[PDB]
Symmetry: C2
Subunit: 345 residues, 2 copies
Amino acid sequence: MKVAVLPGDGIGPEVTEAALKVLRALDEAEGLGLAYEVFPFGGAAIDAFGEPFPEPTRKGVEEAEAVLLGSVGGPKWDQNPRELRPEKGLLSIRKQLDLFANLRPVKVFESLSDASPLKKEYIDNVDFVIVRELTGGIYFGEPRGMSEAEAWNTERYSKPEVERVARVAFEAARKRRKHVVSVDKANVLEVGEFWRKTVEEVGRGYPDVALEHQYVDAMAMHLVRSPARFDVVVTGNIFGDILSDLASVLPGSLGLLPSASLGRGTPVFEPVHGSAPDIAGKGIANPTAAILSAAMMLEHAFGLVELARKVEDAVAKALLETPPPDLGGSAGTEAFTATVLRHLA
Amino acid sequence: MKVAVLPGDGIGPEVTEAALKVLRALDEAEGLGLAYEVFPFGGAAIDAFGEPFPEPTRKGVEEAEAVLLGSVGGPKWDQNPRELRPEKGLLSIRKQLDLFANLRPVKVFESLSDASPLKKEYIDNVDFVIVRELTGGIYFGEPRGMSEAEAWNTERYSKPEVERVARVAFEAARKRRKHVVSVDKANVLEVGEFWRKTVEEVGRGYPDVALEHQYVDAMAMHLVRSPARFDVVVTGNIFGDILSDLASVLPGSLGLLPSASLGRGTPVFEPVHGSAPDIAGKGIANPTAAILSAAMMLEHAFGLVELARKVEDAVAKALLETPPPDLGGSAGTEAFTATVLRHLA
């Protein structure tokens, strides 16, 4: 199991190590053959090598089997130009590794129901994964423009760009509850028609996985009214981006959520959360999304579906037994990684 | 006060009359000079005149000052062609009266908190109006298409189409809490940039109304996390359509919500809800959205802001004192209109 580890800036060093401690425990315990190396990335690499993603790191993530990525960003770098600010690097590891699907799961962890905005009975059992197409659609499609008089933007998709994210989604579904929902506007737009017939084609090949289709406006109401009725959801870019942000409020007690870019190259796995400089070095950072990005690496980069579910259960039990400071508890990063490890045995 | 009344099909006869009983009480009481006439529209007009919007009705709504519209639709008519099915008529009264903005308010009526999906503390005080642009953007913009290979759709807006819906929104805001929020994707799309600079221009002229801007993905999270922080929200078409459907789940105990198309011609005001044939003739239909569409006519078609707030308060008190069958109560249409009237005195 070859992992390029990119701890990044701010709390990325602390929280990526809490994740590596889980992955070493399991490795010791199961014999997984973890081999990992730590590479420079982010504001720390702008400081050291003069650019955010320097060619040792380019090579590193190009030769590994998985990237564990922490977080970059810090104010210190906003001042200077564009390709020398921590976030440029995030599009270059995305371009280089040809990543085209972003997977964002939402789980509302039983113990933390009361922090959710929805009454308990709506969040019970929420476990779904929205795989968003990443590189296409209106954000990048063309023609585009702006006059004194008018502005325009095209939303475009080719059969290839739709089949790529649909196969991620069906394969993605084989590992968890086997149901895909695709999301479109096919009753009004033709891009939506086209998406719908292509995902139904690509669906033929994955017969053990059920497929349903839904409109974006109707899926927006179903993520508050019945979110538990979904396992994997697959959608285009702007709709995946609106819909994953709406889905991120369901857990409530934020900062617990993981992310994984997937594609032709090396899968990248990060927590959804920033550098959080304010608390870097203090021990208090909540490692739950980092530890859960590790579990997504195990499930998508190494096929180890059974073990990823054991790490998500240990972090469930752990959030129940020692909530971190940020959930009305007092467990630092280390005492929390501890109780996670203590249930992996 | 000249009102063409179009009761439509199914429960539209019953619920439009509960609305006219409020408007006659107030008229008697305030001397408003209600003059109203009832015109054929909908499946009943397809049955009688052979088309859903027949030229007496075309004239009727073209000569009145407001339309009270009930609901059309019924299965009986789906079988036959396109311009002879109850819903075609709904686009023709929209085209004819040049309506370009749809106003959808959401209020979570204190007494009905517990039916909402969000915990009480998120819905307390929700009162906002999303004015959606109606005739433009990607649903109608062009070019558009579908090949074996790809599909496309343009999202287009001209300065006129944006200033029209922005002035509705600011004027719309003068009558309630004076704050507009516009909604776009201006950090990624140029149509969104263009919308944002135009709404900020048109904002100069309305200096007593505050203006804020927000991204669609961030407004989607704020309608579940803090919906009370909004009064009037103004957005394009597909985003208004997704965002009003997400906002409709906040009240929970549905079917209570009103709608108003506005424009160059005669304003149209309906409840958001169908014909509901199942219960047409039985007395049980909940008139709350009909009575509240009347109150929106008073506020937007006759400027009678003070009275529209008295009808929304009487229906608040009434929902508290006699919930209709559809909210775990037993009050039919008439006993509910009654307690509304009984607080208007």
